Amino acid sequence: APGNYPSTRRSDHVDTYQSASKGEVPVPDPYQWLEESTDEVDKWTTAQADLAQSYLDQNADIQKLAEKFRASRNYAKFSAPTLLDDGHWYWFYNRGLQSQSVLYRSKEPALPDFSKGDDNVGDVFFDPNVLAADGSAGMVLCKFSPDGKFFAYAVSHLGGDYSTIYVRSTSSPLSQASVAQGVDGRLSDEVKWFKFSTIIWTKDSKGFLYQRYPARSDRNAMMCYHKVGTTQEEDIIVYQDNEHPEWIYGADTSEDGKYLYLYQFKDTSKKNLLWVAELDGVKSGIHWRKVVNEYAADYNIITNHGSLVYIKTNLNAPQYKVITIDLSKDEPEIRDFIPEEKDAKLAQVNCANEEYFVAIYKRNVKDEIYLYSKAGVQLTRLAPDFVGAASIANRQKQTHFFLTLSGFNTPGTIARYDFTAPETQRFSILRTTKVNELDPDDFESTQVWYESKDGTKIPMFIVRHKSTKFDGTAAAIQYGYGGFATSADPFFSPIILTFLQTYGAIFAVPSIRGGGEFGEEWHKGGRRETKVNTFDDFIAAAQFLVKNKYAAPGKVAINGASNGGLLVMGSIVRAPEGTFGAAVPEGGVADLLKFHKFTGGQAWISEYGNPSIPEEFDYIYPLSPVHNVRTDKVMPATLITVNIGDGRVVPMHSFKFIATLQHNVPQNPHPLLIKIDKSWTDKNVKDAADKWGFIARALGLEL
């Protein structure tokens, strides 16, 4: 229980604020000088950093944990494959070295066995890392032509604002081999000024649509059409609007060849227009049937059968739905095809094997996968016990589709559904993620519900190694963010899973208010004047973990970053003594009275309120971690983290908070320390090892 923290000078600096209830309020701010960039601050930072490192050096498990994190750090990433009209399969593969994934082509015209290795079953077709010799050019976006003969790709060099589209034949690889042989085998096509749209081929495979601006703010966008094997001078303007210079455009083409769709956007909401047109291919002076005119709702087209168009929309349905619009009638006949679900956001719909719809719902922060008929009958749920995120990849005419699945236990699993197979054998696993010292199958993701202070029911994710028991024994790592409508969705971290497996601990992720887990009302429920709910939900989660025997008492550690740092710091201030065993806030806000007076501060006003406004000060001040540190409560072992390289949140917040703790509870039984991140395999797990090792020791966990 040492008192040996370095002395922090206390100045006579007093800030004055205005309270709606109390009037003028003088607030002493003796660590105000830590706001400034001076030698005094730099020397105080070194003294604190050195203390922190001295404590970490008495923990020999830090270096042991580092090697385990080094082991599980690297792994390959991949996409689901696509079968093109040339009979070959194409897919992205990243071996885990370079920042850009490489596009592979199957050697044989057949679905590869992906347990053999990507280089054994595939050849490199497009390696974007060699666009520029130094790796300074990136592929932003790409698209194959419907006939499989050509490949369009948008390239962005690090300097430029815009990007440039290029075309190459699918028989012309770009690789380390190919560039060594001589000149790049692309076509001469160089489509400049491309920005903020997809690339959309016509179904004739003759050309593609793309958004472009004039040459050099961004104004007067043009949805254009580029013929393959031509210069940009040969291009057509499909649409522009002189009268609304800020407007942005999207396009789409129907598989049958009949329709060209124009989307129009005016702002950062999801509302959009939808005009429809009939084709021969794409030419100029298009007569647009203006179906969705006026900005009402989100409308994204799924597919069509003749004049019947299927559309995902949120018109009078916040959780989305599917409608049909029949265009053979003179007036379009709008009908509900798949109705809104009250408690399930319709996320994605794809037509599959012509007479079916594959479909993704998010319900209780989890994706569910459904198979529907062309008449809208729900035929079955696929992968019912899956806990995570799912997306669909397919082409409408083919007799299969894929699912890309991810969660806490894996960053990637490709599933295949084969309509031609026997009923019991339609669903299969194409491939899984390989990580040293970690099998995805050893980790179970569940969801439990607890009651917060005001009676609100919050779901919470629990992850464990399968040998760990819910018998009041395990340590728990409780992660949160708690703001900005940013959901704590399932995410993959080898560092965490290795930690759960090493110590028999559990990972706990509560869907606390302030996040986006149940839409804008959920955010609204933990924002500005309701912000205290965010903290009460987080605190009630930790109490629930112990009460219901998920974790042992005194063994729930908390961690979060940026807004999560404020969450952690505010929570150890507010929560009853002994609620938490350890605490690691990373780069967090902590002075909630001054946050808006520093770089990036103003953007947080919509989340916490404005301290300069008297009525808002009154609900802000009682939350401010820097102004609510008591003398008479034992704080849990606390390692505060800041990345001095990371501009985001000024380190001032953490400096003030640690100085305040060390002053208010100098004889605190557990160490209260601040660490400066060494990093702004070998050198990449150093900060994580210090962090997770501090927690393990603080919770009394042995290797």
XYZ file of C-alpha atoms in Angstrom:
703
model
C 0.000 0.000 0.000
C 2.749 2.534 -0.870
C 2.628 6.323 -0.618
C 5.561 6.597 -3.074
C 4.030 8.544 -5.957
C 6.015 11.497 -7.371
C 5.012 14.906 -6.036
C 2.622 16.787 -8.344
C 2.703 20.575 -7.872
C -0.658 22.160 -7.002
C -1.104 25.656 -8.505
C -3.469 28.453 -7.389
C -5.397 28.308 -10.703
C -9.165 28.785 -10.379
C -11.671 28.434 -13.237
C -15.122 30.013 -12.996
C -18.284 28.372 -14.319
C -22.009 29.266 -14.366
C -24.577 26.944 -12.742
C -28.316 27.302 -13.468
C -29.165 26.285 -9.878
C -26.160 27.800 -8.009
C -25.061 30.775 -10.167
C -21.324 31.493 -10.276
C -19.185 28.547 -9.135
C -15.411 28.922 -8.623
C -13.691 25.558 -9.317
C -10.074 25.210 -8.107
C -7.961 23.499 -10.798
C -4.525 22.950 -9.198
C -3.284 20.613 -12.011
C -4.239 23.079 -14.795
C -0.507 23.430 -15.605
C -0.535 19.782 -16.841
C -2.560 21.147 -19.822
C 0.609 22.812 -21.129
C 3.617 21.560 -23.124
C 6.615 22.372 -20.928
C 9.760 20.745 -19.500
C 8.036 20.728 -16.104
C 5.255 18.572 -17.597
C 7.730 16.456 -19.616
C 9.796 15.777 -16.452
C 6.671 14.988 -14.359
C 5.554 12.631 -17.176
C 8.964 10.847 -17.095
C 8.793 10.458 -13.289
C 5.296 8.949 -13.510
C 6.286 6.726 -16.469
C 9.405 5.450 -14.652
C 7.344 4.610 -11.535
C 4.853 2.736 -13.698
C 7.630 0.739 -15.411
C 9.300 -0.079 -12.043
C 6.065 -1.749 -10.867
C 5.667 -3.648 -14.165
C 9.290 -4.916 -13.885
C 8.418 -6.716 -10.589
C 5.828 -8.687 -12.652
C 7.675 -11.517 -14.482
C 4.393 -12.685 -16.141
C 4.460 -9.570 -18.426
C 7.263 -11.040 -20.585
C 5.572 -14.477 -20.519
C 2.249 -12.975 -21.652
C 4.080 -11.081 -24.422
C 5.326 -14.333 -26.009
C 1.773 -15.820 -25.983
C 0.454 -12.646 -27.651
C 3.319 -12.815 -30.156
C 2.258 -16.398 -30.968
C -1.424 -15.703 -31.664
C -0.971 -12.283 -33.343
C -0.693 -13.260 -37.020
C -3.213 -15.045 -39.238
C -4.402 -15.018 -42.829
C -7.558 -13.205 -43.944
C -9.810 -13.986 -46.894
C -13.104 -13.262 -48.658
C -15.693 -15.700 -49.982
C -15.011 -16.701 -53.608
C -17.008 -15.722 -56.716
C -17.567 -17.952 -59.756
C -17.278 -15.893 -62.945
C -18.566 -16.765 -66.428
C -15.082 -18.021 -67.433
C -15.754 -20.995 -65.078
C -13.031 -19.936 -62.597
C -13.366 -18.818 -58.954
C -11.902 -15.506 -57.700
C -11.249 -14.433 -54.096
C -9.170 -12.126 -51.868
C -6.389 -13.579 -49.708
C -4.090 -11.806 -47.262
C -1.234 -13.944 -45.913
C -0.750 -11.500 -42.993
C 2.308 -9.409 -44.026
C 1.295 -6.509 -46.314
C -1.606 -4.097 -45.799
C -3.377 -5.008 -49.102
C -5.055 -8.335 -49.831
C -4.300 -10.053 -53.105
C -6.882 -11.274 -55.600
C -6.517 -14.969 -56.544
C -7.826 -16.973 -59.510
C -8.505 -20.723 -59.207
C -6.070 -22.864 -61.237
C -8.869 -25.249 -62.253
C -12.431 -24.339 -63.295
C -13.834 -25.835 -60.072
C -14.536 -24.891 -56.437
C -11.194 -25.155 -54.593
C -10.432 -27.225 -51.496
C -9.243 -24.328 -49.303
C -7.605 -26.545 -46.633
C -4.677 -27.038 -49.054
C -3.427 -23.416 -49.094
C -4.316 -20.537 -51.417
C -1.069 -20.750 -53.467
C -1.688 -24.492 -54.131
C -5.254 -23.959 -55.443
C -4.884 -20.431 -56.845
C -2.655 -18.149 -58.889
C -2.246 -14.450 -58.197
C -4.375 -12.350 -60.586
C -4.243 -8.894 -58.953
C -1.735 -7.928 -56.273
C -2.421 -4.234 -55.442
C 0.744 -3.956 -53.253
C 2.824 -3.757 -56.478
C 0.717 -0.940 -58.043
C 3.575 1.305 -56.969
C 7.036 -0.175 -56.300
C 7.154 1.454 -52.816
C 3.581 0.313 -51.967
C 2.282 3.918 -52.012
C -0.660 3.122 -54.356
C -3.779 1.381 -53.038
C -6.769 -0.299 -54.611
C -9.761 1.578 -53.128
C -12.436 -0.400 -54.930
C -12.905 -2.953 -57.743
C -15.415 -4.880 -59.851
C -15.383 -7.749 -62.342
C -17.466 -7.483 -65.514
C -20.579 -9.783 -65.659
C -19.048 -11.892 -68.472
C -15.817 -12.437 -66.440
C -13.559 -11.139 -69.247
C -12.537 -7.797 -67.669
C -11.695 -6.296 -64.282
C -12.088 -2.637 -63.284
C -10.217 -1.220 -60.269
C -9.944 2.210 -58.652
C -6.404 3.244 -57.641
C -5.551 5.947 -55.100
C -2.042 7.350 -54.577
C -1.440 8.714 -51.058
C -1.293 12.396 -52.085
C -4.410 12.790 -54.248
C -8.010 13.634 -53.305
C -9.629 11.745 -56.200
C -8.871 8.257 -57.509
C -8.427 6.791 -61.004
C -10.140 3.735 -62.534
C -8.273 1.209 -64.733
C -9.309 -1.867 -66.721
C -7.463 -5.124 -67.335
C -8.310 -8.449 -68.964
C -8.843 -11.272 -66.463
C -6.083 -13.161 -68.376
C -3.531 -10.376 -67.546
C -2.151 -10.746 -64.007
C -0.509 -7.978 -61.980
C 2.114 -9.602 -59.730
C 5.748 -9.479 -58.565
C 6.396 -11.899 -61.428
C 4.456 -9.874 -64.040
C 6.026 -6.462 -63.292
C 9.527 -8.038 -63.379
C 8.757 -9.415 -66.878
C 8.178 -5.833 -68.151
C 5.245 -3.459 -68.722
C 1.876 -3.788 -66.928
C -0.667 -5.632 -69.115
C -3.651 -3.351 -68.406
C -5.585 -1.558 -71.148
C -4.702 2.092 -71.911
C -7.994 3.260 -70.270
C -7.412 5.850 -67.506
C -10.693 7.101 -66.018
C -9.855 10.104 -63.781
C -11.723 12.198 -61.172
C -13.596 9.253 -59.661
C -14.956 9.648 -56.095
C -17.832 8.574 -53.765
C -19.581 5.901 -55.795
C -19.361 2.229 -56.728
C -18.391 0.932 -60.160
C -21.423 -0.618 -61.837
C -21.085 -2.644 -65.038
C -23.849 -2.858 -67.620
C -24.951 -6.501 -68.135
C -23.692 -6.407 -71.750
C -20.180 -6.174 -70.134
C -19.371 -3.362 -72.626
C -18.767 -0.686 -69.991
C -19.457 0.612 -66.481
C -20.965 3.545 -64.600
C -19.002 5.696 -62.152
C -19.247 9.107 -60.442
C -16.773 11.841 -61.403
C -16.031 15.499 -60.685
C -14.431 18.274 -62.799
C -10.620 18.658 -62.925
C -8.464 20.670 -60.482
C -14.814 21.840 -52.512
C -16.354 18.859 -54.360
C -19.348 19.989 -56.475
C -21.189 19.203 -59.726
C -20.886 15.425 -59.717
C -21.642 13.477 -62.907
C -22.764 9.868 -63.151
C -20.907 8.813 -66.290
C -20.511 5.694 -68.429
C -17.137 4.388 -69.680
C -16.818 1.944 -72.600
C -14.064 -0.692 -72.134
C -11.085 -0.244 -74.473
C -11.652 3.506 -74.929
C -10.188 6.755 -73.543
C -12.119 8.810 -70.966
C -12.981 11.184 -73.878
C -15.338 8.448 -75.220
C -17.457 8.553 -72.006
C -21.147 9.516 -71.714
C -22.722 11.656 -68.991
C -25.699 9.557 -67.791
C -26.842 12.254 -65.352
C -25.890 15.575 -63.751
C -27.845 18.356 -61.967
C -26.636 21.930 -62.528
C -29.326 23.200 -60.110
C -28.247 21.098 -57.086
C -24.396 21.192 -57.139
C -23.973 19.352 -53.787
C -25.932 16.246 -54.877
C -24.273 12.813 -55.151
C -25.261 9.882 -57.389
C -25.440 6.078 -57.327
C -26.365 3.631 -60.086
C -27.439 0.040 -60.570
C -28.323 -2.307 -63.438
C -30.719 -5.282 -63.412
C -29.414 -8.777 -64.326
C -31.915 -9.179 -67.198
C -30.571 -6.035 -68.934
C -33.835 -4.066 -68.965
C -33.355 -1.515 -66.173
C -30.849 1.202 -65.294
C -31.447 2.719 -61.847
C -30.378 6.220 -60.693
C -30.009 6.981 -56.961
C -29.709 10.608 -55.797
C -28.415 11.773 -52.385
C -28.405 15.320 -50.907
C -26.945 14.838 -47.365
C -25.522 12.393 -44.766
C -28.950 10.838 -44.000
C -29.879 7.594 -45.803
C -32.830 9.193 -47.689
C -32.575 8.973 -51.511
C -34.357 9.339 -54.870
C -34.810 6.451 -57.306
C -35.420 6.995 -61.027
C -35.814 4.086 -63.474
C -35.043 3.755 -67.197
C -35.218 1.125 -69.975
C -32.235 0.201 -72.217
C -31.460 -1.259 -75.690
C -26.821 -0.266 -73.873
C -26.273 2.988 -71.955
C -26.583 6.151 -74.067
C -27.263 9.885 -73.385
C -30.616 11.691 -73.114
C -32.188 8.977 -70.965
C -35.930 9.374 -70.318
C -36.133 8.849 -66.547
C -39.303 7.382 -65.016
C -39.144 9.208 -61.674
C -40.660 6.670 -59.259
C -39.171 7.868 -55.944
C -39.029 11.639 -56.327
C -38.745 13.780 -53.158
C -36.511 12.730 -50.240
C -38.619 10.464 -48.004
C -36.762 7.206 -47.272
C -33.887 4.790 -47.947
C -34.569 2.787 -51.135
C -32.073 0.167 -52.278
C -33.004 -2.152 -55.144
C -32.578 -5.916 -54.664
C -33.737 -7.339 -58.028
C -36.621 -7.609 -60.517
C -38.758 -10.152 -62.363
C -39.961 -8.201 -65.395
C -41.775 -5.003 -64.380
C -41.986 -6.128 -60.728
C -39.089 -4.544 -58.814
C -38.087 -5.718 -55.306
C -36.858 -2.920 -52.994
C -35.420 -2.798 -49.460
C -36.711 0.370 -47.742
C -37.434 2.086 -44.413
C -40.463 4.133 -45.602
C -42.811 4.029 -42.568
C -40.607 1.253 -41.201
C -37.493 2.312 -39.189
C -36.496 -1.356 -38.925
C -36.413 -2.007 -42.661
C -38.732 -4.021 -44.943
C -39.095 -5.181 -48.565
C -41.726 -3.810 -50.969
C -42.574 -4.562 -54.566
C -43.286 -1.919 -57.208
C -45.120 -3.076 -60.362
C -44.166 -0.854 -63.317
C -46.506 -2.443 -65.941
C -49.262 -0.400 -64.295
C -49.282 3.276 -65.395
C -49.198 4.307 -61.731
C -46.637 2.210 -59.800
C -48.386 -0.330 -57.513
C -46.516 -0.410 -54.164
C -47.066 -3.540 -52.015
C -45.486 -4.935 -48.815
C -43.540 -8.073 -49.785
C -41.693 -8.865 -46.560
C -43.180 -6.723 -43.764
C -41.206 -4.806 -41.138
C -40.257 -6.644 -37.972
C -40.800 -4.505 -34.848
C -37.688 -5.852 -33.087
C -35.455 -6.860 -36.051
C -33.592 -4.581 -38.461
C -33.619 -6.043 -41.959
C -29.913 -5.538 -42.863
C -29.404 -7.213 -46.252
C -31.418 -9.074 -48.930
C -30.026 -10.864 -51.995
C -31.908 -12.874 -54.606
C -30.331 -16.355 -54.858
C -30.791 -19.249 -57.324
C -33.448 -17.138 -59.123
C -36.538 -18.215 -57.051
C -35.233 -17.443 -53.524
C -34.147 -14.620 -51.234
C -31.305 -14.854 -48.722
C -31.693 -12.415 -45.909
C -29.998 -10.988 -42.781
C -31.674 -9.591 -39.662
C -29.971 -7.916 -36.710
C -31.934 -8.675 -33.495
C -30.391 -8.099 -30.026
C -26.987 -7.056 -31.431
C -26.715 -10.388 -33.377
C -27.214 -11.355 -37.011
C -29.725 -14.050 -37.992
C -29.761 -15.626 -41.447
C -32.952 -16.561 -43.319
C -33.909 -18.247 -46.581
C -37.116 -17.018 -48.253
C -39.130 -17.994 -51.339
C -39.881 -15.600 -54.259
C -43.406 -15.260 -52.820
C -41.949 -14.016 -49.487
C -42.451 -17.220 -47.468
C -39.725 -17.760 -44.843
C -38.530 -21.294 -45.655
C -35.890 -21.767 -42.930
C -33.360 -20.222 -40.568
C -29.718 -21.068 -41.394
C -27.079 -21.447 -38.639
C -29.530 -20.881 -35.713
C -26.865 -21.025 -32.934
C -24.510 -18.562 -34.663
C -23.477 -15.599 -32.521
C -21.947 -12.810 -34.577
C -22.070 -10.864 -37.829
C -23.011 -12.352 -41.228
C -23.133 -11.065 -44.824
C -24.216 -12.627 -48.135
C -22.115 -12.903 -51.299
C -23.570 -14.387 -54.485
C -24.764 -14.000 -58.058
C -28.520 -14.339 -58.675
C -28.376 -16.941 -61.465
C -26.095 -19.429 -59.680
C -27.203 -22.519 -57.733
C -25.249 -21.515 -54.582
C -24.509 -18.604 -52.269
C -21.942 -17.821 -49.549
C -22.055 -16.407 -46.049
C -19.108 -14.604 -44.444
C -19.404 -15.133 -40.705
C -17.471 -13.389 -37.942
C -17.700 -12.913 -34.171
C -15.719 -12.934 -30.917
C -14.263 -16.413 -31.631
C -13.266 -15.926 -35.308
C -12.664 -13.009 -37.735
C -13.746 -15.119 -40.727
C -15.602 -18.268 -41.667
C -16.972 -18.837 -45.188
C -20.128 -21.008 -45.329
C -21.655 -22.313 -48.585
C -25.288 -23.167 -49.283
C -25.712 -25.517 -52.284
C -29.294 -25.779 -53.633
C -28.374 -28.740 -55.869
C -27.178 -30.885 -52.922
C -29.426 -33.181 -50.820
C -31.500 -31.401 -48.106
C -29.374 -32.513 -45.145
C -26.132 -31.542 -46.965
C -26.868 -28.090 -48.477
C -25.043 -26.053 -45.814
C -21.251 -26.587 -45.546
C -18.109 -24.815 -44.295
C -15.827 -23.655 -47.105
C -13.019 -22.379 -44.856
C -12.006 -21.148 -41.398
C -9.399 -18.859 -39.812
C -6.070 -20.422 -38.666
C -4.420 -18.826 -35.616
C -1.514 -20.258 -33.613
C -2.538 -21.348 -30.097
C -6.265 -20.603 -30.727
C -9.106 -22.724 -32.117
C -12.374 -20.785 -32.701
C -14.338 -23.914 -31.638
C -12.963 -23.752 -28.051
C -14.739 -20.470 -27.313
C -18.463 -20.065 -26.558
C -20.325 -16.774 -27.140
C -23.611 -16.266 -25.212
C -25.892 -13.358 -24.343
C -27.459 -12.717 -20.902
C -29.780 -9.978 -19.580
C -29.456 -7.849 -16.440
C -31.493 -5.017 -14.912
C -29.949 -1.556 -14.619
C -30.720 0.912 -11.812
C -33.836 2.361 -13.488
C -35.316 -1.057 -14.504
C -34.026 -1.055 -18.096
C -33.056 -4.539 -19.327
C -29.611 -4.591 -21.016
C -28.206 -7.570 -22.949
C -24.569 -8.490 -22.431
C -22.190 -10.711 -24.395
C -20.244 -13.331 -22.419
C -17.286 -15.165 -24.015
C -15.325 -18.017 -22.397
C -13.008 -20.916 -23.146
C -15.331 -23.945 -22.957
C -13.513 -25.469 -19.946
C -14.186 -22.350 -17.802
C -17.139 -22.527 -15.409
C -19.751 -20.018 -14.281
C -19.250 -21.008 -10.612
C -18.138 -17.719 -8.989
C -14.481 -18.558 -9.774
C -13.374 -16.816 -13.008
C -11.888 -13.369 -13.469
C -13.824 -11.175 -15.918
C -12.563 -8.582 -18.398
C -15.482 -6.159 -18.887
C -15.087 -4.049 -22.036
C -17.107 -0.994 -22.970
C -17.272 2.131 -25.122
C -20.570 3.749 -24.071
C -21.280 6.572 -26.499
C -21.806 8.082 -29.951
C -24.340 5.429 -31.091
C -21.290 3.174 -31.522
C -22.397 -0.377 -30.717
C -20.196 -2.794 -28.798
C -20.681 -5.417 -31.536
C -18.885 -8.759 -31.480
C -15.216 -8.314 -32.523
C -12.179 -10.620 -32.856
C -9.074 -10.141 -30.705
C -6.373 -12.877 -30.414
C -5.033 -10.924 -27.401
C -8.311 -11.352 -25.481
C -8.951 -15.001 -26.428
C -5.361 -15.899 -25.471
C -6.029 -14.093 -22.152
C -9.269 -16.089 -21.546
C -7.566 -19.386 -22.376
C -4.393 -18.607 -20.377
C -6.069 -17.532 -17.089
C -9.540 -19.157 -17.338
C -11.085 -15.675 -17.445
C -14.254 -14.518 -19.222
C -14.898 -11.589 -21.604
C -17.976 -9.473 -20.795
C -19.393 -6.935 -23.289
C -22.584 -5.127 -22.094
C -24.774 -3.356 -24.673
C -24.901 -0.237 -22.495
C -26.991 2.823 -23.312
C -25.131 5.559 -25.180
C -24.264 2.988 -27.831
C -26.317 2.224 -30.940
C -27.335 -1.363 -30.177
C -31.089 -0.565 -30.283
C -31.029 2.471 -32.594
C -31.120 6.189 -31.820
C -33.369 5.704 -28.757
C -30.606 3.560 -27.226
C -28.037 6.295 -27.889
C -30.561 8.873 -26.643
C -31.053 6.799 -23.460
C -27.388 7.419 -22.492
C -26.593 10.889 -23.829
C -26.162 14.440 -22.517
C -28.711 14.724 -19.619
C -29.350 10.912 -19.653
C -25.582 10.135 -19.738
C -25.489 8.887 -16.115
C -27.464 5.820 -17.432
C -24.389 4.785 -19.487
C -22.358 4.548 -16.281
C -25.192 2.904 -14.279
C -25.604 0.210 -16.988
C -21.850 -0.487 -17.005
C -21.649 -0.612 -13.204
C -24.777 -2.841 -12.962
C -23.167 -5.239 -15.479
C -20.114 -5.790 -13.223
C -22.389 -6.243 -10.176
C -24.499 -8.790 -12.121
C -21.402 -10.747 -13.227
C -20.494 -11.305 -9.543
C -24.046 -11.719 -8.183
C -24.985 -14.475 -10.679
C -21.607 -16.312 -10.412
C -20.134 -15.493 -13.835
C -17.067 -14.015 -12.117
C -15.499 -14.094 -8.643
C -15.908 -11.102 -6.313
C -13.151 -8.500 -6.683
C -12.129 -10.039 -10.051
C -14.019 -7.942 -12.608
C -11.482 -5.706 -14.399
C -12.656 -2.892 -16.703
C -11.123 -1.525 -19.874
C -12.018 0.863 -22.675
C -10.490 3.490 -24.967
C -11.237 7.131 -25.949
C -14.897 7.402 -24.823
C -14.230 4.023 -23.106
C -11.454 5.685 -21.069
C -13.978 8.185 -19.697
C -16.355 5.233 -19.108
C -13.724 3.416 -17.004
C -12.542 6.531 -15.100
C -16.102 7.668 -14.353
C -17.113 4.147 -13.349
C -14.334 3.686 -10.712
C -15.302 7.120 -9.295
C -19.039 6.280 -9.134
C -19.265 2.514 -8.466
C -19.372 1.246 -4.879
C -16.010 0.386 -3.312
C -14.869 -3.127 -4.329
C -17.055 -3.306 -7.471
C -13.948 -3.553 -9.678
C -10.677 -5.440 -9.188
C -8.668 -3.482 -11.756
C -9.059 -0.632 -14.247
C -7.235 0.297 -17.474
C -8.518 3.458 -19.233
C -6.749 4.190 -22.538
C -6.529 7.786 -23.808
C -9.727 8.880 -22.070
C -11.486 12.168 -21.400
C -11.581 12.875 -17.617
C -11.905 16.681 -17.139
C -15.562 17.032 -18.367
C -15.605 20.791 -17.579
C -12.741 21.682 -20.019
C -12.930 18.927 -22.722
C -14.516 21.259 -25.310
C -11.613 23.775 -25.015
C -9.098 21.323 -26.598
C -8.420 19.779 -30.049
C -11.363 17.594 -31.121
C -13.325 18.690 -28.034
C -16.305 20.420 -29.691
C -17.453 17.140 -31.323
C -18.040 15.652 -27.855
C -20.623 18.387 -26.931
C -23.471 16.454 -28.627
C -22.552 13.493 -26.415
C -21.954 15.169 -23.023
C -23.517 18.604 -23.280
C -21.842 21.985 -23.205
C -20.269 22.896 -19.815
C -20.512 26.637 -20.705
C -24.341 26.334 -20.753
C -25.597 26.713 -17.123
C -28.298 24.007 -17.274
C -25.912 21.515 -18.860
C -23.038 22.249 -16.432
C -25.439 21.060 -13.673
C -25.659 17.498 -15.086
C -22.060 17.435 -16.395
C -20.230 18.432 -13.182
C -21.482 15.416 -11.111
C -20.175 13.058 -13.866
C -16.710 14.654 -14.301
C -14.102 12.123 -13.111
C -11.545 14.893 -12.331
C -14.094 16.637 -10.022
C -15.599 13.619 -8.186
C -12.604 11.692 -6.759
C -13.339 11.024 -3.081
C -10.836 10.698 -0.203
C -12.759 7.901 1.576
C -13.114 5.121 -1.048
C -10.469 2.530 -1.944
C -9.888 2.608 -5.713
C -9.046 -0.589 -7.613
C -5.562 -1.133 -9.039
C -5.406 1.381 -11.898
C -3.021 1.595 -14.871
C -3.923 4.638 -16.966
C -2.722 4.494 -20.590
C -2.008 7.319 -23.068
C -0.548 7.196 -26.594
C 1.386 10.502 -26.823
C 1.597 10.035 -30.610
C -2.214 9.775 -30.973
C -3.718 13.288 -31.436
C -7.330 12.185 -30.696
C -7.741 13.118 -27.011
C -5.236 15.389 -25.284
C -3.240 13.490 -22.584
C -4.025 16.386 -20.183
C -7.225 14.500 -19.191
C -5.317 11.427 -17.934
C -2.535 13.539 -16.333
C -5.064 15.538 -14.302
C -7.001 12.417 -13.239
C -3.918 10.465 -12.092
C -2.596 13.524 -10.230
C -6.009 13.857 -8.534
C -6.135 10.174 -7.457
C -2.556 10.208 -6.122
C -3.432 13.359 -4.128
C -6.852 12.212 -2.821
C -5.919 8.607 -1.912
C -2.130 8.533 -1.392
C -2.357 5.513 0.967
C -4.692 3.576 -1.388
C -3.935 -0.183 -0.934
C -3.610 -0.763 -4.694
C -1.243 1.089 -7.055
C -2.676 3.980 -9.074
C -0.298 4.587 -11.993
C -0.001 6.145 -15.455
C 1.921 4.613 -18.402
C 3.015 6.152 -21.728
C 2.576 3.759 -24.695
C 5.890 2.600 -26.189
C 4.349 2.246 -29.673
C 2.853 5.291 -31.457
C 5.191 -9.504 -33.608
C 8.198 -8.327 -31.552
C 7.404 -4.635 -30.835
C 3.609 -4.747 -31.348
C 2.467 -6.637 -28.188
C 4.515 -4.632 -25.641
C 1.724 -2.250 -24.595
C -0.851 -5.075 -24.561
C 1.409 -7.275 -22.382
C 1.955 -4.496 -19.801
C -1.795 -3.842 -19.790
C -3.132 -7.432 -19.489
C -0.314 -8.460 -17.140
C -1.066 -5.479 -14.837
C -4.680 -6.716 -14.670
C -3.787 -10.385 -14.036
C -1.445 -9.535 -11.136
C -3.940 -6.973 -9.745
C -6.622 -9.737 -9.783
C -4.240 -12.375 -8.311
C -3.989 -14.652 -11.355
C -0.980 -16.961 -11.821
C 0.558 -18.654 -14.882
